[PDB]
Enzyme design. Sequence first.
Site, PDB file in Angstrom:
ATOM      1  N   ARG B  38     -27.874 -16.423 -24.334  1.00  0.00           N
ATOM      2  CA  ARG B  38     -26.850 -17.411 -24.037  1.00  0.00           C
ATOM      3  C   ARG B  38     -26.282 -17.102 -22.651  1.00  0.00           C
ATOM      4  O   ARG B  38     -26.237 -15.942 -22.253  1.00  0.00           O
ATOM      5  CB  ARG B  38     -25.803 -17.421 -25.162  1.00  0.00           C
ATOM      6  CG  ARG B  38     -24.574 -16.553 -24.938  1.00  0.00           C
ATOM      7  CD  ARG B  38     -24.179 -15.786 -26.179  1.00  0.00           C
ATOM      8  NE  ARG B  38     -24.035 -16.574 -27.407  1.00  0.00           N
ATOM      9  CZ  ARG B  38     -24.114 -16.038 -28.620  1.00  0.00           C
ATOM     10  NH1 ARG B  38     -24.607 -14.822 -28.798  1.00  0.00           N
ATOM     11  NH2 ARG B  38     -23.738 -16.730 -29.674  1.00  0.00           N
ATOM     12  N   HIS B 122     -24.358  -3.665 -40.992  1.00  0.00           N
ATOM     13  CA  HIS B 122     -25.217  -2.916 -40.100  1.00  0.00           C
ATOM     14  C   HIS B 122     -26.125  -2.007 -40.916  1.00  0.00           C
ATOM     15  O   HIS B 122     -26.041  -1.986 -42.154  1.00  0.00           O
ATOM     16  CB  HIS B 122     -24.376  -2.216 -39.050  1.00  0.00           C
ATOM     17  CG  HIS B 122     -23.775  -3.139 -38.076  1.00  0.00           C
ATOM     18  ND1 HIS B 122     -24.445  -3.533 -36.942  1.00  0.00           N
ATOM     19  CD2 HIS B 122     -22.563  -3.705 -38.028  1.00  0.00           C
ATOM     20  CE1 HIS B 122     -23.641  -4.309 -36.231  1.00  0.00           C
ATOM     21  NE2 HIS B 122     -22.499  -4.413 -36.871  1.00  0.00           N
ATOM     22  N   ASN B 125     -24.918  -0.178 -43.936  1.00  0.00           N
ATOM     23  CA  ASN B 125     -24.665  -1.026 -45.092  1.00  0.00           C
ATOM     24  C   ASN B 125     -25.952  -1.294 -45.872  1.00  0.00           C
ATOM     25  O   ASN B 125     -25.957  -1.224 -47.106  1.00  0.00           O
ATOM     26  CB  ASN B 125     -23.957  -2.327 -44.681  1.00  0.00           C
ATOM     27  CG  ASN B 125     -22.662  -2.060 -43.952  1.00  0.00           C
ATOM     28  OD1 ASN B 125     -22.508  -2.325 -42.753  1.00  0.00           O
ATOM     29  ND2 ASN B 125     -21.719  -1.493 -44.666  1.00  0.00           N
ATOM     30  N   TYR B 126     -27.051  -1.653 -45.183  1.00  0.00           N
ATOM     31  CA  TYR B 126     -28.267  -2.044 -45.909  1.00  0.00           C
ATOM     32  C   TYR B 126     -28.875  -0.839 -46.665  1.00  0.00           C
ATOM     33  O   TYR B 126     -29.337  -0.940 -47.804  1.00  0.00           O
ATOM     34  CB  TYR B 126     -29.218  -2.692 -44.892  1.00  0.00           C
ATOM     35  CG  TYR B 126     -28.589  -3.726 -43.970  1.00  0.00           C
ATOM     36  CD1 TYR B 126     -27.838  -4.793 -44.464  1.00  0.00           C
ATOM     37  CD2 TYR B 126     -28.722  -3.631 -42.597  1.00  0.00           C
ATOM     38  CE1 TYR B 126     -27.237  -5.718 -43.615  1.00  0.00           C
ATOM     39  CE2 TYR B 126     -28.141  -4.555 -41.743  1.00  0.00           C
ATOM     40  CZ  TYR B 126     -27.383  -5.604 -42.246  1.00  0.00           C
ATOM     41  OH  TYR B 126     -26.787  -6.493 -41.372  1.00  0.00           O
ATOM     42  N   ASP B 152     -32.477  -0.394 -39.404  1.00  0.00           N
ATOM     43  CA  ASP B 152     -32.793  -1.183 -38.240  1.00  0.00           C
ATOM     44  C   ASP B 152     -34.284  -1.129 -37.925  1.00  0.00           C
ATOM     45  O   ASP B 152     -34.918  -2.170 -37.823  1.00  0.00           O
ATOM     46  CB  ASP B 152     -31.942  -0.795 -37.041  1.00  0.00           C
ATOM     47  CG  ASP B 152     -30.522  -1.359 -37.066  1.00  0.00           C
ATOM     48  OD1 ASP B 152     -30.212  -2.082 -38.040  1.00  0.00           O
ATOM     49  OD2 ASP B 152     -29.745  -1.061 -36.117  1.00  0.00           O
TER      50      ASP B 152
HETATM   51  C1  LIG Z   1     -26.752  -0.213 -35.870  1.00  0.00           C
HETATM   52  C2  LIG Z   1     -26.388  -1.630 -35.430  1.00  0.00           C
HETATM   53  C3  LIG Z   1     -27.151  -2.660 -36.302  1.00  0.00           C
HETATM   54  O1  LIG Z   1     -27.304  -2.394 -37.511  1.00  0.00           O
HETATM   55  S1  LIG Z   1     -27.668  -4.185 -35.458  1.00  0.00           S
HETATM   56  C4  LIG Z   1     -28.138  -5.241 -36.882  1.00  0.00           C
HETATM   57  C5  LIG Z   1     -27.012  -6.063 -37.538  1.00  0.00           C
HETATM   58  N1  LIG Z   1     -27.507  -6.974 -38.577  1.00  0.00           N
HETATM   59  C6  LIG Z   1     -28.298  -8.013 -38.273  1.00  0.00           C
HETATM   60  O2  LIG Z   1     -28.631  -8.268 -37.086  1.00  0.00           O
HETATM   61  C7  LIG Z   1     -28.769  -8.858 -39.436  1.00  0.00           C
HETATM   62  C8  LIG Z   1     -28.545 -10.367 -39.282  1.00  0.00           C
HETATM   63  N2  LIG Z   1     -27.464 -10.709 -38.359  1.00  0.00           N
HETATM   64  C9  LIG Z   1     -26.167 -10.711 -38.690  1.00  0.00           C
HETATM   65  O3  LIG Z   1     -25.728 -10.383 -39.811  1.00  0.00           O
HETATM   66  C10 LIG Z   1     -25.198 -11.158 -37.591  1.00  0.00           C
HETATM   67  O4  LIG Z   1     -25.887 -11.532 -36.394  1.00  0.00           O
HETATM   68  C11 LIG Z   1     -24.132 -10.069 -37.234  1.00  0.00           C
HETATM   69  C12 LIG Z   1     -24.708  -9.164 -36.129  1.00  0.00           C
HETATM   70  C13 LIG Z   1     -23.692  -9.230 -38.443  1.00  0.00           C
HETATM   71  C14 LIG Z   1     -22.812 -10.724 -36.814  1.00  0.00           C
HETATM   72  O5  LIG Z   1     -23.038 -11.722 -35.786  1.00  0.00           O
HETATM   73  P1  LIG Z   1     -22.163 -13.047 -35.539  1.00  0.00           P
HETATM   74  O6  LIG Z   1     -21.447 -12.689 -34.295  1.00  0.00           O
HETATM   75  O7  LIG Z   1     -21.551 -13.642 -36.766  1.00  0.00           O
HETATM   76  O8  LIG Z   1     -23.418 -14.001 -35.214  1.00  0.00           O
HETATM   77  P2  LIG Z   1     -24.340 -14.909 -36.172  1.00  0.00           P
HETATM   78  O9  LIG Z   1     -25.756 -14.430 -36.203  1.00  0.00           O
HETATM   79  O10 LIG Z   1     -23.799 -15.182 -37.532  1.00  0.00           O
HETATM   80  O11 LIG Z   1     -24.310 -16.242 -35.282  1.00  0.00           O
HETATM   81  C15 LIG Z   1     -24.163 -16.149 -33.845  1.00  0.00           C
HETATM   82  C16 LIG Z   1     -24.715 -17.426 -33.263  1.00  0.00           C
HETATM   83  O12 LIG Z   1     -24.341 -17.571 -31.882  1.00  0.00           O
HETATM   84  C17 LIG Z   1     -24.763 -18.902 -31.542  1.00  0.00           C
HETATM   85  N3  LIG Z   1     -25.822 -18.788 -30.534  1.00  0.00           N
HETATM   86  C18 LIG Z   1     -26.912 -17.955 -30.523  1.00  0.00           C
HETATM   87  N4  LIG Z   1     -27.629 -18.044 -29.427  1.00  0.00           N
HETATM   88  C19 LIG Z   1     -26.958 -18.977 -28.654  1.00  0.00           C
HETATM   89  C20 LIG Z   1     -27.203 -19.500 -27.372  1.00  0.00           C
HETATM   90  N5  LIG Z   1     -28.220 -19.136 -26.592  1.00  0.00           N
HETATM   91  N6  LIG Z   1     -26.310 -20.397 -26.884  1.00  0.00           N
HETATM   92  C21 LIG Z   1     -25.279 -20.764 -27.653  1.00  0.00           C
HETATM   93  N7  LIG Z   1     -24.958 -20.349 -28.872  1.00  0.00           N
HETATM   94  C22 LIG Z   1     -25.838 -19.439 -29.322  1.00  0.00           C
HETATM   95  C23 LIG Z   1     -25.134 -19.631 -32.839  1.00  0.00           C
HETATM   96  O13 LIG Z   1     -24.755 -20.986 -32.807  1.00  0.00           O
HETATM   97  C24 LIG Z   1     -24.338 -18.798 -33.837  1.00  0.00           C
HETATM   98  O14 LIG Z   1     -22.937 -19.113 -33.756  1.00  0.00           O
HETATM   99  P3  LIG Z   1     -21.996 -19.983 -34.771  1.00  0.00           P
HETATM  100  O15 LIG Z   1     -22.351 -21.438 -34.664  1.00  0.00           O
HETATM  101  O16 LIG Z   1     -22.223 -19.708 -36.257  1.00  0.00           O
HETATM  102  O17 LIG Z   1     -20.608 -19.596 -34.277  1.00  0.00           O
HETATM  103  C25 LIG Z   1     -26.481  -1.961 -33.940  1.00  0.00           C
HETATM  104  C26 LIG Z   1     -27.712  -2.094 -33.305  1.00  0.00           C
HETATM  105  C27 LIG Z   1     -27.783  -2.403 -31.957  1.00  0.00           C
HETATM  106  C28 LIG Z   1     -26.627  -2.591 -31.224  1.00  0.00           C
HETATM  107  C29 LIG Z   1     -25.376  -2.468 -31.826  1.00  0.00           C
HETATM  108  C30 LIG Z   1     -24.118  -2.634 -31.037  1.00  0.00           C
HETATM  109  O18 LIG Z   1     -23.180  -3.234 -31.554  1.00  0.00           O
HETATM  110  C31 LIG Z   1     -24.003  -2.068 -29.651  1.00  0.00           C
HETATM  111  C32 LIG Z   1     -23.037  -2.578 -28.783  1.00  0.00           C
HETATM  112  C33 LIG Z   1     -22.918  -2.084 -27.489  1.00  0.00           C
HETATM  113  C34 LIG Z   1     -23.748  -1.074 -27.044  1.00  0.00           C
HETATM  114  C35 LIG Z   1     -24.716  -0.560 -27.882  1.00  0.00           C
HETATM  115  C36 LIG Z   1     -24.841  -1.048 -29.178  1.00  0.00           C
HETATM  116  C37 LIG Z   1     -25.315  -2.170 -33.191  1.00  0.00           C
END
Ligand SMILES: C[C@H](C(=O)SCCNC(=O)CCNC(=O)[C@H](O)C(C)(C)COP(=O)(O)OP(=O)(O)OC[C@@H]1O[C@@H](n2cnc3c(N)ncnc32)[C@H](O)[C@@H]1OP(=O)(O)O)c1cccc(C(=O)c2ccccc2)c1
Lengths: 354, 354
Positions: B38, B122, B125-126, B152
């Site tokens: 995005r 994250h 959790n799983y 992951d």
């Molecule tokens: C160790 C750790 C991990 O475990 S990573 C794995 C986490 N689990 C998953 O990935 C499984 C499925 N996904 C989700 O459960 C969600 O994604 C969410 C991340 C929980 C929350 O995300 P939300 O913010 O609610 O997003 P969403 O998926 O529900 O929807 C977001 C969407 O955004 C919109 N849109 C997407 N692309 C575009 C675009 N190009 N343009 C416009 N809009 C876009 C969609 O419309 C949608 O939005 P809504 O309409 O519903 O609002 C882990 C691993 C790696 C990194 C990290 C870090 O946090 C980290 C951070 C900094 C540095 C290093 C690491 C954590």
Amino acid sequence: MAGPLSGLRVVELAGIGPGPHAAMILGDLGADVVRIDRPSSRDAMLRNRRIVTADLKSDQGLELALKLIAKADVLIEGYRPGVTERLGLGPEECAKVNDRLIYARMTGWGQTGPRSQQAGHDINYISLNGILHAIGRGDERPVPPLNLVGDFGGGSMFLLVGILAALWERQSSGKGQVVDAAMVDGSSVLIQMMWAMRATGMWTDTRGANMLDGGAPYYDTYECADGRYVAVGAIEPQFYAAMLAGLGLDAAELPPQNDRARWPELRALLTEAFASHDRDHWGAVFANSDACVTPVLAFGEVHNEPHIIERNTFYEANGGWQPMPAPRFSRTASSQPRPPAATIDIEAVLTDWD
Amino acid sequence: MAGPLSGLRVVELAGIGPGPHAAMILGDLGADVVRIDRPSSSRDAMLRNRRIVTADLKSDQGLELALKLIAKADVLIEGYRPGVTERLGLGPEECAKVNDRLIYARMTGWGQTGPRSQQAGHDINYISLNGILHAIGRGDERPVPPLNLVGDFGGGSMFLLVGILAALWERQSSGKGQVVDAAMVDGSSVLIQMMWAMRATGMWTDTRGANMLDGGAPYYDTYECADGRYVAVGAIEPQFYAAMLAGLGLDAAELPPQNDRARWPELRALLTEAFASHDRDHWGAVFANSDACVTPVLAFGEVHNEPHIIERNTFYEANGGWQPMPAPRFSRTASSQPRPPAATIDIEAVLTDW
Ligand SMILES: C[C@H](C(=O)SCCNC(=O)CCNC(=O)[C@H](O)C(C)(C)COP(=O)(O)OP(=O)(O)OC[C@@H]1O[C@@H](n2cnc3c(N)ncnc32)[C@H](O)[C@@H]1OP(=O)(O)O)c1cccc(C(=O)c2ccccc2)c1
Ligand SMILES: C[C@H](C(=O)SCCNC(=O)CCNC(=O)[C@H](O)C(C)(C)COP(=O)(O)OP(=O)(O)OC[C@@H]1O[C@@H](n2cnc3c(N)ncnc32)[C@H](O)[C@@H]1OP(=O)(O)O)c1cccc(C(=O)c2ccccc2)c1
């Protein structure tokens, strides 16, 4: 045979750990998997196979084996380097009887180099590449993450990605090739995120002081009133805020989520909160929540968890529950694993295969 | 573009963790990987082997550019909650109308349906839900997360990869793509199938820190040395254990039996005192080229100095930091050194090129 790998043919030379796990997943997804053991099965890792014996040291054992391999797509072997060569089952011998074969070599240390002939297990492979040092509490010695990271995650799974990437390459070239899957390599790629983060000053070599190693109070387990545990994984501030509200904790009383110098203090506050109710209570409070708080279930409780039951992540066999195949496929769905297929005769298979 | 996946074309809807790790490996192996982020938006090496593009997918023009790419590509990866791609106009059904060859790869934690399918989560959790987390760490303490390695990557991205590549093989028969549903809770359960097998046949308890491979066995654990650094011991087989004992200066005659579990406290005390009497590098010398299954536990920062790591080029240098080279390795169609993250490209330029 059900699954996307219907009619893939795979010969597995029996070993332990990764090679058998890779063969299992191939089976799981519909592959025709024949495993050659030695004349000297209650392990469900041997599901979705035909078992045949053969002294590969005998002349006939070798000849039979080479006939199987000639009629197959993939060979898996998980012995030390040099072993299959000496049997006359090396890559070059196999390429004479089938230049299309995918020749898959599963080791820990790899095919060459100073440790290539050293015995080892998972714990050793992950000790050398930084992974093991990074796991466990900081005031204590590193703890092995079972054998999930060397054998399977950085092991079998990379063998699989290699076997299937080479099958794709074959479609455009008509030719097999040799896949060298070393656990010390795969496990390093498996942990690339940490190497990325260390390069940008966002991961230390200090154990127990990082976002994901258990040092962060919002990414760790907590003991509850009943002695059972929850896991907290509330990295994103909005999930973290949701968790604090559900704990009854006023964000103003607490240090910043990401002030690492005050993590000790934050942890003590969250520790007291989770301790005041039992695990089940928190499981209830946080169902349907984005607070990233889940009950830590022991194996024997997994069969009672709604989300587990209804997605059929497991099936009943044998003594007890086993994981159903993964991942899942819309059109060509895997079926429930066949129990280990008691020893047939290697000639039978050959007729069946031509 | 070098590697066995040369030619393979991949569209990645930007997410975090498994989704990009999968995409990386495809890139690593020769695939042509286009990443749509995005515009609200590279020093993350997890985004190597990529062309990045911007695009508001909420806009009408965004969606239709996106939908053109997908049409000209073999694989789509997305890792958003279920329903997100649908509501964007990029769901499976919409994709199947502009390209029925597409492998539609869906990376989640909880899966596509069931009670937890919309909960944020994250890694921790799983793996808390399926028994894994509970099994990791010492017995007198609360579970410790094995970084984000098991949910992951090993149980997430890697199953995504197998599914993509298994479906590509299927699309050699049928000529049609399909939907790949990769959930971390399922993949990680298959990752630990060994423990489910042993559990069934009485060879694994639910008691943390009391099994052969969780750190409970004195011959499969780490030990603190004289210098406060650690070695790993993985001497499961009796012959390797004997070799270890001899290197330690301990006579088998004075020790309890290796597998007399009731005398493990004594055995552990004996091994603890022995390892503690010299420093890690001593033990490294004593045991190199041995089958004793004793290795130094290196920290990330020291890995680049280990002979066997250097010589096999497990790592390459990039932008002040070592990074893992692709795995696994291929005899004929070898991977290249990964290209660093590429400053952005216009989605039009890409549609041209394609
Ligand atoms: C160790 C750790 C991990 O475990 S990573 C794995 C986490 N689990 C998953 O990935 C499984 C499925 N996904 C989700 O459960 C969600 O994604 C969410 C991340 C929980 C929350 O995300 P939300 O913010 O609610 O997003 P969403 O998926 O529900 O929807 C977001 C969407 O955004 C919109 N849109 C997407 N692309 C575009 C675009 N190009 N343009 C416009 N809009 C876009 C969609 O419309 C949608 O939005 P809504 O309409 O519903 O609002 C882990 C691993 C790696 C990194 C990290 C870090 O946090 C980290 C951070 C900094 C540095 C290093 C690491 C954590
Ligand atoms: C947690 C843990 C793991 O990490 S499992 C992963 C262990 N690492 C590897 O697999 C890496 C590559 N392999 C090796 O490094 C060795 O294989 C070896 C394991 C050190 C054993 O060394 P050796 O016993 O010396 O065997 P070898 O590879 O050197 O060669 C032996 C060969 O045997 C002969 N023959 C093979 N097939 C036949 C046949 N059909 N007929 C006749 N002979 C055959 C070969 O000719 C060769 O013989 P030589 O000429 O060279 O003598 C882990 C994971 C899972 C399970 C376990 C358990 O131990 C366990 C046990 C019970 C219950 C549960 C678990 C441990």
